[PDB]
Each structure stands twice: as C-alpha cells, then as structure tokens.
C-alpha cells in the first residue's frame, strides 16, 4: 500500500480538454516501478481511454469525451489514488 505515492502525472489532459478532441497526459512510474494503472474519467458523458506504453519508462494516456462539462480524472496505481488524483478537468466545446 502506498506505492502510488511515488507516481507522478502531468500534461495538458489533466488541465483542460475540448469535447471530441483527444486529451493526452503522461504518467511516470519510475520510482513505484511496474504495477496496475487504472484510469477513470467521471463526467456527463462516457470517455474512451487509450494507453501508450512508452520505452522512456513513462505511460501515455489519451481520452476523448464528447460532451462539454466538468470531469474528474482519477489515476490509481495498484488501486490507490496517486497524489492529486482525482484531477478536476474542464472540458469545453471545441474552437474553430
């Protein structure tokens, strides 16, 4: 218990997102090592969540929601929130 405390996560997808547009962030599991990463997005529409197992030792996550609103993005390592998880993420309607 508490492996997750050594795991860090950042990138634009844990800060802001646009509806229908993929939101990417990174998770660096160097210190905690290997384990089970469970990602949750909780909000007014269903997220599609993808992983990217990078050679750099980091893991990539991209998610897409379609409805603008306020989402919470959870990152658990071995079933336990990592620091600052849940992340509160505002998803806006796209521009352009």
């Amino acid at each position: 218990m508490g492996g997750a405390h050594k795991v860090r996560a950042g990138g634009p997808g844990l800060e802001r997102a646009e509806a229908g547009v993929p939101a990417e962030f990174s998770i660096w599991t160097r210190e905690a090592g290997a384990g089970g990463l469970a990602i949750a997005v909780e909000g007014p529409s269903k997220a599609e969540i993808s992983f990217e197992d990078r050679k750099d030792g980091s893991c990539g996550v991209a998610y897409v929601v379609q409805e603008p609103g306020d989402y919470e993005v959870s990152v658990k390592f071995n079933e336990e929130h990592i620091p600052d998880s849940p992340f509160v993420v505002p998803v806006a309607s796209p521009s352009g």
């Binding site: 998770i27 090592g33 384990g35 469970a38």
Partner: peptide, 13 residues
C-alpha cells in the same frame, strides 16, 4: 447524467 469510465493497464518494468 453521470458516466464513469474505468480502463486498466499494467505499466511494465
């Protein structure tokens, strides 16, 4: 209404 979507992956060593 509120949807919660969970996906799991195993970050390798």
């Amino acid at each position: 209404a509120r949807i919660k979507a969970i996906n799991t992956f195993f970050a390798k060593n």
